[PDB]
């Protein structure tokens, strides 16, 4: 539970990557808007009940553009 | 190789098909061959009833022969037979060689040497004959011809593997037959190989008897035919595993009581002795 809250908080804290399931288990106008929206992620906001109860050259067709970014 | 025949086919009342070869100029030694086939057809029963041989499926290959006249005969026929001589000739045709080169080479060399001195060799095993043999091996016939042919004859490797497995056992059986009965002149055109299963039939199999006195003898440099090309077709692993053991298995099965073989051979030997004396 609270996986999405953890992902949003990690994005806010400065981790823009895609963290794995185990990791959670253990600017431009659009970017600024997303940051402002995600800053409001909270554990208990309208969640009181939930909170209490809880090389190869060439290329191809699907090659990533630049990669080089990994989660923590 | 030196004959021809017409092939008849008959349909049975149950739907089966049977093939026969008509031999119009039948050889002069047909009765003796039929007697040999009779004897080994009798021994096949003991082979089928014994355990060490029944689990290996060891049997002699003996087609049925029926004479119609003293000079015509019909013989059960396998349509996928080929002889060793035919394989050698096919190789020669495909590789642009003359099939008669080895024999002409041998004759020329032996003539040239016999015109010179023909002594000083250790006792009789002439070293010049060994040199001629080595030269023929080096220049004309290498030991990978039959294996190459049969590898080319089977696009699917499972077929080749099964064919070779059958071939080894059949060769062991033929070796026992020719060794015990003193069958002498085993030329390459007398060995027929079935491409559909891997069976071996030896044609014109008759025992040899000494002219001076009545008894069985061979008097040849080798006990049986096992040449480099056959060795290469079988392979060292199969030669160690199947061929050597099957001969002993057959010999053990057929001599369990020693009286059985004597009582089986008595009438055959009597007929041979009567023919010799006549």
């Amino acid at each position: 539970a609270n996986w999405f809250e953890l992902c949003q908080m990690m994005y806010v804290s400065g981790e823009t990557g895609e963290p794995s399931l185990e990791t959670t288990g253990i600017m431009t106008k659009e970017e600024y808007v997303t940051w402002s929206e995600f800053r409001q992620a909270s554990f208990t906001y309208r969640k009181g009940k939930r909170f209490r109860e809880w090389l190869t050259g060439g290329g191809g067709l699907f090659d990533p553009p630049n990669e080089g970014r990994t989660p923590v | 190789i030196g004959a021809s025949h017409r092939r008849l086919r008959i349909r049975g009342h149950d739907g089966s098909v049977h093939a026969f070869a008509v031999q119009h100029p039948a050889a002069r030694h047909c009765r003796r061959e039929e007697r040999v086939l009779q004897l080994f057809r009798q021994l096949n029963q003991t082979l089928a009833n014994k355990k060490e041989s029944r689990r290996r499926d060891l049997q002699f290959t003996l087609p049925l022969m029926v004479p119609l006249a003293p000079h015509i005969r019909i013989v059960q026929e396998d349509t996928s037979y080929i002889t060793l001589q035919s394989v050698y000739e096919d190789h020669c045709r495909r590789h642009g060689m003359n099939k008669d080169e080895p024999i002409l080479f041998t004759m020329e060399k032996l003539r040239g040497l016999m015109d010179a001195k023909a002594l000083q060799k250790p006792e009789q095993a002439v070293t010049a004959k060994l040199e001629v043999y080595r030269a023929i091996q080096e220049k004309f016939v290498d030991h990978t011809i039959v294996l190459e042919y049969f590898q080319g004859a089977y696009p699917n490797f499972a077929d080749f593997w099964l064919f070779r497995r059958r071939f080894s056992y059949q060769l062991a059986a033929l070796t026992f037959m020719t060794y015990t009965m003193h069958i002498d002149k085993r030329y390459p055109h007398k060995m027929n190989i079935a491409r559909g299963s891997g069976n071996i039939w030896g044609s014109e199999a008759v025992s040899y008897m000494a002219p001076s006195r009545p008894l069985f003898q061979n008097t040849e440099p080798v006990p049986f035919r096992l040449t480099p090309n056959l060795q290469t077709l079988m392979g060292p692993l199969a030669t160690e595993g199947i061929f050597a053991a099957s001969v002993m298995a057959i010999a053990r099965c057929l001599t369990e009581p020693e009286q059985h073989l004597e009582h089986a051979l008595t009438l055959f030997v009597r007929d041979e002795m009567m023919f010799w004396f006549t």
Binding site: - | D14, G15, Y149, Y154, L162, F163, R166, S197, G198
Partner: protein, 209 residues
């Protein structure tokens, strides 16, 4: 008796000979089971002729559906098992045909074969089955496939083989068939060019014919 005899006789001159065999199938499907002893006694004197005629037509059939009709006619004649014990050699070829066909014929053939295996002794049955035994066992071994394949057919085949026992690995008389090519030369081909290469390569002229 008149129905059967007239159907067989009139099939030879008809414009559509198969209608009479459709009629015969309709009749046979209705009087199955040992509930019609009187009709079986009436029909008994026609059994051998009917089976011989049916076997003749199967050999000359050129389409799968016609073969199916004749096989179904052969395997469902109205008779008692004791009266069918002779003439059992007339059922061997249609059985082999049915064991390699759609689901219904496969089930019918399995039923017939199980009945024969259960109701007779080896010394009586094996000589009758000898002419077709290799094809029979090859067809039987083709129904042994795991779950997604029909488990009814597979389990029936396994039961039949288990009941046969030691006789299920004793039927072979020849060595084993192997396929071979009549010549050892190269096969016919034409040349092709790979874009990055500098030479031509042979391509067999027999791939989808």
């Amino acid at each position: 008796v008149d129905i059967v005899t007239k159907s067989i006789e009139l099939s030879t001159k008809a414009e559509e000979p198969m209608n009479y065999f459709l009629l015969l199938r309709s009749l046979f499907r209705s009087i199955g089971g040992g509930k019609f002893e009187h009709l079986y006694k009436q029909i008994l004197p026609l059994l051998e002729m009917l089976l011989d005629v049916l076997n003749n037509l199967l050999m000359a059939a050129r389409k799968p559906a016609e073969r199916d009709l004749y096989v179904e006619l052969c395997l469902t004649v109205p008779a008692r098992l004791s009266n069918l014990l002779p003439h059992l050699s007339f059922l061997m070829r249609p059985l082999v045909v049915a064991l390699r066909a759609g689901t219904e014929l496969v089930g019918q053939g399995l039923r017939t074969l199980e009945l024969c295996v259960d109701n007779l002794t080896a010394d009586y049955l094996d000589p009758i089955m000898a002419p077709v035994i290799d094809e029979l066992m090859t067809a039987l071994f083709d129904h042994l496939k795991p779950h997604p394949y029909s488990h009814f057919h597979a389990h029936t085949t396994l039961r039949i083989l288990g009941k046969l026992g030691g006789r299920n690995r004793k039927f072979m008389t020849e060595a084993l068939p192997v396929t071979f090519q009549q010549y050892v030369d190269d096969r016919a081909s034409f040349d092709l060019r790979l874009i990055g290469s500098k030479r031509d390569r042979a391509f067999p002229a027999h791939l989808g014919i």
